[PDB]
Structure formats: C-alpha cells, structure tokens
Design an enzyme around this catalytic site. Structure first.
Site, mmCIF file in Angstrom:
data_model
loop_
_atom_site.group_PDB
_atom_site.id
_atom_site.type_symbol
_atom_site.label_atom_id
_atom_site.label_comp_id
_atom_site.label_asym_id
_atom_site.label_seq_id
_atom_site.Cartn_x
_atom_site.Cartn_y
_atom_site.Cartn_z
ATOM 1 N N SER A 1 0.803 -1.219 0.000
ATOM 2 C CA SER A 1 0.000 0.000 0.000
ATOM 3 C C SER A 1 0.839 1.273 0.000
ATOM 4 O O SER A 1 0.265 2.365 -0.072
ATOM 5 C CB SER A 1 -0.959 -0.001 1.191
ATOM 6 O OG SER A 1 -0.302 -0.375 2.387
HETATM 7 NA NA NA Z 1 0.315 1.062 6.044
#
Ligand code: NA
Ligand code: NA
Ligand code: NA
Length: 640
Positions: free
Chosen positions: A384
């Site tokens: 991410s």
């Molecule tokens: Na993170």
C-alpha cells in the site's frame, strides 16, 4: 578438382577434430609413418597433441584462407591461416603448411610436428611460464574495503604433536573449547584419508586476537579474499571460490590456480577484478634453446571497482533488520547513488570462500527464510506504499480531487455483488476520507475506489511513464518490473488491487526506489546508480510537479499527525516525508495468510537521501517503521 575438393574436406575434418579436442580422431586422419609421409604414428601423434595442447590449454581452432593445390600425382599441398585460444590469450594469424597423401580413394595428411605449431621440427619442445594476476578490490564511495585481499590467520592441528589417549583427548577438548570448535569436527578433520600424522590439518580461519595454543594447535599465515562487512553485504558483494577444471575448460584464460567470483559483484565483475595472466609460451629445440616466442605479455593485476555504497549505511541497514527476512535500499534520490543494498537473513561470505562444511552450507540452503536470496533484486508487490503513485497519477489526469471527501462506512468495501465475497480492507474506520486523510491513515478503500473511478486506461497511461519493462543498467541480475501478467487487467478486482500496490505487481526494492524518486525531483525519475564514476541518468515528466507539491506535504503528515501510520518516526525530530505499507500474500505451506511490511521515507527539505525498507513475512507486532530510526538518523546527518 575432385581430388582437390577431397583434400579440402580432410583438412577441414582434421581442424574440426582438433577444434573439438578429439586428438585421437585427428591422428587417425594422418598417413603412415615414413620419411615424406607422416613423421609419427597415430598413438604418438595423439600423445603429442594431448601433452602440448593440454599444457597450454589450447581451446578452439579456427582457420581461414585454405588453399589445396597439386604438387605430384599422389601428393597435394595445403596451406591456411589459423588462430587458437590459450591460457595466455588468443594466438592469431598462424601460417600452417603441409602435404596430403592420396591412395585408393582416401586422402590423408602427411603429419609433421609443424602441424602442432607452425615452426616445430622433430624433437622441439614447448614451454609455458605463467605469472598469476592479483585480484582487484571492491571499495565503497569513500574507499573503504568491501572485498579485498588480506593476510588471514589459519588455525590448524598437527596430529603428531597431539597425543595418544588421555593427552590426545584432553588437547582436542582444549582446542575445541578455545576456538569455538566441535570435538567431533576436529576428530573428523584429522581422520580424513589425505591426512598423515605429521601433516598440518587446517581447521578454520580465526579473526581477531589469538588465545593460548594447546599442544598440536598451530597458526599459519595465508593470503586470501576477505570481506570486512561479512554477511552485512554478502548478497551484493558475493564470494570467490577455487577455480576448477570445468572453469578452465570454459575459459582457458582463467588462472588454473586462482579464485573466481561465484555470486554477487565478485562474479558480475570477475573479468575486471581478475586481471590477465602474464607469462610466455615459447618453442625450444632439443637443446632447450629458445626457438620461437609464440605468446608473451606481462601480468596485469585486476583493476579496483568503486561503488556508490556507504559501508557504514550498509552495515547499519543490515543490522537494523535484526536477522529477520527483509531488505533495505538507501539512495541519494537526486543522483541515484545506491548507498545501501541490505538483504536479510544472510550468509557468511568469508566462511564460503575459506571452505565451508557441507552441514553449514546445507543449513543456509534449507533455511526457510533463504539467506541466499538477493531480496533487493527480487520482485515483490510494492504494498500500500504504492498509493503515492496512484495518487500522483490521479492528480495528473484530474480524476482525483484532493479536497473531494468520500464517505466510507466500515473496514471492508465492495464495488457490487459481482465481486462475490472479496472486499478491499482498511485498518482505520474513518468516515470522511479525502486524499490527505487516506495517505495519513493508509486507507486502501479510498484509493481502490479512486482507481476504479479513474479506469484502467487512464491508470496505465500514468503507469507507463515509469520504468515498467525496462532493464536497469546495473551489474545486478534482476527482472524488469511489471504492472501485471498481461497488458490488460480484465478484472475490476485486479484493477482495484493494483491501485494500492497488490495484484500482479512485481517491483524489486531497487526499482521501487527509482519510481519513488519522482517525489524528490519534482516529478523527474532518477535512475539508480551503483558504480560511482558513472553518469546520472533521469527521466523527465514522469508525474506532474503539481502532484509532487500536493502529495509531499501529505507525506509529512504521515509522520507528524498523531494518527499517522509512521508517527513513531516523529520522535527523531528531523524533516521526514514517509509512507508505510502492507502487502497481503497467500501461501500454501501455511494455510494462514502472510503479510509484508513496507516503509518509504526521504528528507523533504534537502532531498538528500531516500530509503525503502521491507520486512518479508513479518512476525506479529513487527514492522519496517520500528526498525528505521537508526538508519534515518545516519542518512539525515551525512547526506543533505
Ligand atoms: Na500502512
Ligand atoms: Na521479477
Ligand atoms: Na492478469
């Protein structure tokens, strides 16, 4: 003509047999032993080629300008240029002569000693003298030794000066206790078939101070390759091993008595580091008087190689991983200098080059964390952390409004029922989420929705501006990064997963630091650089400068905000722009899922440094962020 073509073929077959190292087959193409026919029989022709060509490591016989004419009705003369490779280099333009015998329908070669080397007659001899080249050194950006040649203290035992019963057993236990050795290893060493009772049986290379030497234990001084950083740089630097007969058969210019790089930079730069063997290949007469010098040149020691690596940052980055699986890459993002390339866990390169037991090597090979992997060169899903890139792409094509606030309820989200039971997951249940909030809390749902709204077509347009599919000009074996397996996602789920760094993305840590360098160069990608003398390369307009000026202030809050995922780094008191990340991996060995912990960080004030760290298959409550404080302090102090 029909006999001239037959004479040309037999010469080509004779050269081919010598080219393939089949001396017995080449000898069978010769005439019978006589005065004007062949000078030797087939067996002694085989022995002469086997002895002379083997002594000079002759490999590959290539000829040119073959001319077969007619002298007498039974003898045809031939001549050609030729060249061959030896242990002293290529021996070019050799003028060979000779005659062919024609009886029945078989054309043979009137073999003479001048068919070994052009100017040999009768009982001429061949001599080869060689001087071994000293191996070059691998040094860091400040000249510190990373791979050098030092004087090593070798511990060994003489089984004669040991004892018989009580004296022998007590001395072995004393040596094993005084040098961190196994009592079974010392007994197995002195029990090998090669060992004689008066011989010096080497045990291990000792480093540091030398304790007391019990009876039988003696220290001898040997020269060999040495790696000061040890396992902290084993995957990058590599190790050298003893050159084998198989190595010489592949490249005769190697020193038959030296070392050769087996992995890492030692292997990638083996040609420049090993130098060239010096010596002389000459022909003498029966009296030993020098008749012809075929090849002669002086020894050329290996050249040194200076890397961009910081030996202090390399050791700090590796130690910070605490022996856990992971990697750390540190760069100066404006030039691309690779300051550190750490991979953990690691192996002992000094133990590898100084003889390692089959047990210790087996432990390395069967370690499930696999220390032999160069994790900085292995492709991973970026995690991410990749939301920075998707955000920058969304700002450039206008699909992402920095102030638009999405309403996200819960921790799981789905586009519709066609996704089945799959849902994008986030960690923080924040209701009102804009771009700044999503980067601070690492909201995967926000970016997954923005990726779907952006669309695959516009998403790939921004992704194609990076280095996907490119071969980096680095002396490290690696595969090009990829967006996915194919040119199309053909899946809304895969498209959304790619938006926050999951999916089929494969990017190694070095390629990650290259892509992330745009945030330290106003949207310009600066290619990484490992060799210090090389020129800086870059790629203009990868992302817009407006996107950089929007995202970097948000990345400051990832550290400074009280709920920022990297808030523990605010304790340093240094200007930091960071972005944490996770990647969920499924495995078959364990039915439960594993995850990787990521950390990206750089100085947003001076753009002096940039690091990308990862923990692979992290233990619970572990992360890359909790291990980066020491390296961040060092890079901030020494790279501005
Ligand atoms: Na993170
Ligand atoms: Na790959
Ligand atoms: Na695919």
């Amino acid at each position: 003509t029909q006999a001239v073509e037959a004479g040309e073929k037999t010469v080509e077959q004779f050269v081919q047999a010598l080219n393939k190292g089949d001396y017995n087959k080449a000898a069978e193409m010769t005439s019978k032993k006589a005065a004007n026919k062949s000078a030797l029989s087939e067996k002694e022709i085989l022995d002469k080629y086997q002895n002379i060509y083997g002594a000079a490591d002759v490999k590959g016989l290539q000829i040119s300008n073959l001319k077969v004419d007619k002298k007498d009705d039974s003898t045809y003369s031939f001549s050609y240029k030729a060249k061959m490779n030896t242990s002293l280099g290529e021996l070019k333009d050799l003028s060979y002569k000779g005659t062919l015998d024609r009886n029945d329908g078989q054309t043979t070669i009137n073999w003479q000693p001048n068919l070994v080397f052009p100017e040999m007659e009768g009982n001429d001899k061949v001599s080869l003298t060689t001087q071994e080249a000293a191996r070059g050194n691998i040094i860091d950006r400040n000249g510190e030794p990373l791979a050098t040649t030092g004087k090593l203290k070798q511990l060994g035992v003489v089984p004669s000066k040991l004892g018989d019963g009580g004296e022998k057993t007590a001395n072995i236990k004393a040596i094993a206790s005084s040098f961190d050795l196994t009592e079974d290893a010392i007994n197995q060493a002195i029990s090998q078939s090669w060992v004689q009772p008066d011989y010096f049986v080497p045990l291990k290379i000792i480093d540091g101070a030398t304790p007391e030497l019990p009876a039988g234990a003696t220290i001898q001084e040997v020269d060999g390759r040495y790696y000061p950083l040890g396992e902290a740089a084993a995957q990058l630097i590599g190790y050298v091993g003893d050159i084998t007969a198989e190595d010489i058969d592949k490249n005769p210019e190697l020193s038959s008595n030296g070392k050769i790089g087996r992995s890492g930079l030692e292997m990638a730069f083996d040609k420049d580091l090993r130098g060239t063997t010096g010596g002389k290949l000459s022909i003498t007469d029966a009296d030993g008087v020098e008749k012809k010098v075929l090849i002669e040149h002086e020894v050329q020691n290996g050249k040194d190689i200076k890397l961009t690596i910081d030996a202090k940052a390399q050791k700090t980055a590796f130690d910070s991983l605490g022996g856990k699986a992971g990697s750390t890459v540190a760069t100066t993002p404006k030039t691309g200098d690779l300051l550190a390339l750490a991979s953990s866990p690691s192996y002992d390169p000094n133990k590898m080059t100084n003889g390692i037991s089959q047990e210790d090597y087996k432990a390395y090979e069967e370690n499930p964390e696999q220390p032999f992997i160069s994790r900085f060169a292995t492709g991973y899903a970026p995690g991410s952390t990749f939301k920075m890139i998707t955000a920058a792409i969304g700002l450039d094509n206008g699909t992402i409004d920095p102030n638009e606030v999405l309403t996200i309820n819960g921790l799981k989200w789905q586009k519709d029922s066609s996704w089945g039971s799959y849902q994008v997951t986030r960690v923080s249940d924040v209701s009102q989420v804009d771009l700044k909030t999503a980067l601070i809390y690492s909201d995967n749902i926000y970016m997954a929705q923005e990726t779907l709204k952006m669309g695959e077509k516009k998403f790939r347009i921004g992704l194609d501006k990076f280095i996907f599919g490119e071969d980096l000009d680095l002396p490290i074996s690696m595969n090009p990064a990829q967006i996915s397996n194919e040119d199309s996602f053909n899946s809304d789920i895969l498209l959304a997963d790619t938006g926050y760094g999951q999916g089929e993305l494969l990017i190694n840590p070095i390629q990650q630091a290259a892509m992330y360098s745009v945030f330290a160069n106003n949207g310009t990608l600066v290619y990484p650089k490992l060799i210090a003398d090389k020129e800086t390369k870059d790629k203009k307009n990868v992302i817009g400068e407006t996107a950089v000026q929007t995202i970097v202030p948000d990345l400051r809050e990832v550290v400074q905000d009280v709920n920022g995922t990297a808030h523990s780094l605010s304790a340093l008191g240094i200007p930091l722009a960071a972005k944490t990340g996770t990647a969920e991996i499924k495995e078959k060995q364990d039915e439960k899922g594993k995850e990787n912990s990521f950390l990206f960080a750089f100085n947003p004030d001076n753009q002096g440094y940039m690091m990308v760290s990862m923990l692979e298959n992290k233990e619970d409550d572990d992360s890359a962020t909790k291990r980066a404080s020491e390296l961040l302090q060092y890079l901030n102090q020494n790279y501005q």
